[PDB]
Ligand binder design. Structure first.
Ligand SMILES: *[C@@H]1O[C@H](CO)[C@@H](O[C@@H]2O[C@H](CO)[C@@H](O[C@H]3O[C@H](CO)[C@@H](O)[C@H](O[C@H]4O[C@H](CO)[C@@H](O)[C@H](O)[C@@H]4O)[C@@H]3O)[C@H](O)[C@H]2NC(C)=O)[C@H](O)[C@H]1NC(C)=O
Ligand SMILES: *[C@@H]1O[C@H](CO)[C@@H](O[C@@H]2O[C@H](CO)[C@@H](O[C@H]3O[C@H](CO)[C@@H](O)[C@H](O[C@H]4O[C@H](CO)[C@@H](O)[C@H](O)[C@@H]4O)[C@@H]3O)[C@H](O)[C@H]2NC(C)=O)[C@H](O)[C@H]1NC(C)=O
Ligand SMILES: *[C@@H]1O[C@H](CO)[C@@H](O[C@@H]2O[C@H](CO)[C@@H](O[C@H]3O[C@H](CO)[C@@H](O)[C@H](O)[C@@H]3O)[C@H](O)[C@H]2NC(C)=O)[C@H](O)[C@H]1NC(C)=O
Ligand SMILES: *[C@@H]1O[C@H](CO)[C@@H](O[C@@H]2O[C@H](CO)[C@@H](O[C@H]3O[C@H](CO)[C@@H](O)[C@H](O)[C@@H]3O)[C@H](O)[C@H]2NC(C)=O)[C@H](O)[C@H]1NC(C)=O
Ligand code: CL
Ligand code: CL
Lengths: 426, 25, 426
């Protein structure tokens, strides 16, 4: 007569894309739409029990989250879990929910190992996956002649969820799975100046197609040093793996888009440097349902959550929680429609998998593995104005690169530089 | 710190090495 | 009026040094001695509740063990946890028990990160630690003039607890913490023949003082290939990190000790190869209390556990569980003796830490960090007979290398070869 949904997310910290101050109103929107739909669980009153994934210091925790999972499981016996979004929170909770035979839904947990559904059974990812980043990088290399060697630099903050590590892990494993080219990698520490001589040296010794996963400022400083050392777009290309567009403003206003601008008198130097730089991000959903969702999310979060949802790519995470929930409610209603129950985890999950769906994020496809295909945008600068804009778009389901608004990929040599230099790297 | 060693104790962080010098993966 | 001890170990699988078929009777022995001692918890009837750390396939699980911990915690509210011994089992249980403010005792869990007691609070390790292996390797290098470079090769079976990884991590981190020499490392897969050309090449390109953590047969085959390729004790030394002496028989009988002997007609070749090979193991306890413990352990396991405890270095793990238990019971009695309670986790733990104790393993010292100092033996072959024997002993508390039975460390050149070759590695 009613459905119990257990939530394990950051209930107090509002810094995460999957924080409850941002996911909570998006989920309330999805529940209010389940009410207004007589074709989705008619009569069931879907209830929600919350559990915080964060520890005493307020960051997401490999300990608070699985404890919360066990506490909600025995206190309420839910039919489905929502979250966590952090990798180290989601891995233990995922293994619990797999063992409990309870479906798990999350728009977080993009790590490679969550994709091993043999272990993380009945885990459905409706947000981005880092293997999907590798699909985009694969398609990018196939469409640009780079079939030999790439270099990946990445850095994290000690004690975080290691987002750049997992980003690089997904790119690295999938790309070598599909292209079998040499992918060199190097970890650094952003605050440690000793690494910058080492990085610049590895930049000019280990690759010319160079992916960097770091903060905006670190990527900016790295570019400034690369120009200062004479590394230009004729030989090198520097991709910034900034999937949430932290180095850019939102796609709603703030025209134009300038990541090299900083106000420290280095901005003229940074623009010349950033001529060799392109930014890889998630794709902003286009459909008008998304913009209407953003308006209702902002209203409902400022209303019943005392939080101000600003514009940006991070909002695709609450939007995907919303969509995943509706995708699940429909799958339950389909299972009920054939004599099943709300606890037929395997039946429900297989209805959700290998299935296309229409949500506020537009067209969303769950693949055979239970993971949402992920679309990416490629930002490039206009050599005239210097501002960055989307020039390429990757459809994750079709794995196609489509040019955007008749733009072209900027190359100082008129075509992309080779992934291997003239007479070897020496 | 280390590029390969010292990073947590969950099998989620041992799916590729990626800081390590390995012939597998 | 009674003490509840929660156990999370392999209750069914008897392949682990810390399996219950072997730790159970050693704990039974320690409880029976608590009864017979009127100075250890007089009147308390110490009860035990068990929880299996293994999953459905019967191997130790990063999921079954923390679930078992939560199940015993709410069903019995124990005052102390025993085990797990697997790293991936012990890490989540350790974080739970740290959060629960309940002391944790184990003779397993030797990984580096368990040593961060800031996180694994009230975790007391009474068995070996892999940082202590780094202490021994440090003292070995200081006493032999190797102050430049070493190479570490290690291999694991996919899906195990990664024992060689954690062994090498402990050695690697501590050795560079104390000596700051260049420690090269390389992982391989034992069953993959592609790696053996790569290993042999890295052996003669990356070091001359060479540590290998692998199975006995892999270490043997690597030696055979090193001789076949002309790598002898005049330039190279190959240490086998065989802490449980898997490549050796027990110290009780089976005279003499021949790890190169296999019965495949290669034995004559293996002996000449093994002239360059030395084996690092844990130290067999000397004291006669240990031998008497072994006799009672064998009797009690064959009695109430239907298991046959064979001789070998692995028995120091049940012996240390035993000793740690008594070391804990005394600490509780001391805490009771000053008005404390059995739940004063921090008071009990600090009485155990930075403390020497006398148990069936002889002299055992808990360091300031909560970890038992670990003694190591160095095995070497007699160039006359070819059999291996202890020639060096390491006292972990005093960090001194003592020669054993007036033996000398065998060198084909009369002294150890340099850790850096003649005119560089080229
Ligand atoms: C990324 O690539 C994906 C892979 O191609 C695209 O998926 C495609 O999405 C379209 C719609 O977005 C979908 O079209 C049809 O889907 C229905 C199932 O086959 C079909 O019944 C529909 O047809 C009906 O409606 C049309 C009018 O719309 C009528 O003319 C018809 O007579 C009929 O009544 C509809 O045409 C494709 O099936 C689907 N392809 C796959 C392989 O799933 C994504 O859209 C694309 N995303 C973006 C943002 O570009
Ligand atoms: C590895 O190195 C460790 C570090 O040195 C050694 O530890 C030492 O262990 C010995 C005994 O095993 C211990 O000796 C004394 O310990 C008591 C505490 O100080 C002290 O009261 C004792 O003295 C009493 O007994 C003797 C007879 O035994 C009498 O003559 C005395 O008058 C007194 O009544 C005892 O002498 C050391 O203190 C201890 N040192 C440290 C720094 O902890 C380990 O034994 C060694 N292990 C091995 C296997 O080599
Ligand atoms: C909300 O979450 C934020 C990110 O998860 C968090 O920011 C970060 O806070 C941590 C403290 O927990 C900082 O780091 C430190 O972590 C350990 C724990 O003390 C220390 O040992 C380390 O040395 C390090 O100093 C991070 O630097 C910081 N990162 C950022 C980007 O701000 C917020 O503090 C959380 N806020 C609340 C109210 O919970
Ligand atoms: C008792 O524990 C033993 C070691 O923990 C275990 O031996 C090992 O068994 C596993 C099977 O669980 C073998 O491996 C495989 O693991 C996964 C899970 O199926 C597979 O996907 C892998 O490809 C791999 O084949 C190990 O190889 C094996 N190792 C050894 C040294 O024997 C025993 O099976 C356990 N016995 C009982 C009764 O529980
Ligand atoms: Cl989370
Ligand atoms: Cl265990």
């Amino acid at each position: 007569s009613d459905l119990t949904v257990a939530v394990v997310l950051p209930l107090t910290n509002t810094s995460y894309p999957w924080s409850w101050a941002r996911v909570g109103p998006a989920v309330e929107l999805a529940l209010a739409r389940v009410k207004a739909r007589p074709d989705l669980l008619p009569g069931w009153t879907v209830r929600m029990v919350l559990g915080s994934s964060e520890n005493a210091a307020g960051v997401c925790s490999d300990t608070a989250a699985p404890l919360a999972a066990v506490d909600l499981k025995w206190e309420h016996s839910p039919a489905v879990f929502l979250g966590p979004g952090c990798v180290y929170s989601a891995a233990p909770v995922g293994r619990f929910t797999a063992h409990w035979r309870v479906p798990l839904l999350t728009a977080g947990a993009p790590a490679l190992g969550i994709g091993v559904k043999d272990e993380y059974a009945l885990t459905t990812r409706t947000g981005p996956s880092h293997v999907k980043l590798g699909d985009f990088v694969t398609a990018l290399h196939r469409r640009l002649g780079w079939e030999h060697q790439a270099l990946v630099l990445y850095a994290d903050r000690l004690g975080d969820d290691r987002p750049c590590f997992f980003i690089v892990e997904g790119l690295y494993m999938r790309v070598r799975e599909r292209l079998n080219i040499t992918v060199n990698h190097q970890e650094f520490v952003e605050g440690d100046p000793d690494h910058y001589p080492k990085l610049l040296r590895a930049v000019r010794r280990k690759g010319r197609v160079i992916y960097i996963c770091s903060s905006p400022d670190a990527f900016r400083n790295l570019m400034l040093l690369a120009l200062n050392a004479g590394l230009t777009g004729e030989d090198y290309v520097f991709f910034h793996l900034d999937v949430f567009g932290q180095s850019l403003k939102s796609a709603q206003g703030l025209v134009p888009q300038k990541p090299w601008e900083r106000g420290d008198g280095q901005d003229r130097s940074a623009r010349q440097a950033f001529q060799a730089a392109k930014i890889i991000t998630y794709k902003e959903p286009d459909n008008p349902e998304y913009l209407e969702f953003l308006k209702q999310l902002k209203l409902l979060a400022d209303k019943k959550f005392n939080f101000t949802v600003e514009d940006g790519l991070k909002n695709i995470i609450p939007a995907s929680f919303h969509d995943g929930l509706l995708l699940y409610v429909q799958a339950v209603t389909e299972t009920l429609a054939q004599g099943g129950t709300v606890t037929d985890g395997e039946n429900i999950t297989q209805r959700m998998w290998n299935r296309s769906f229409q949500g506020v994020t537009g067209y969303l496809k769950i693949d055979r593995n239970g993971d949402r295909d992920t679309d990416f945008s490629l930002w490039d600068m206009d050599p005239e104005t210097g501002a960055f804009r989307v020039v390429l778009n990757y459809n994750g389901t079709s794995q196609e690169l489509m040019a955007v608004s008749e733009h072209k990929l900027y190359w100082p040599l008129g075509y992309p530089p080779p992934d291997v230099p003239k007479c070897g790297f020496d | 710190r280390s590029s390969c060693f010292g990073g947590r104790m969950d099998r989620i962080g041992a799916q590729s090495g990626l800081g390590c010098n390995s012939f597998r993966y």
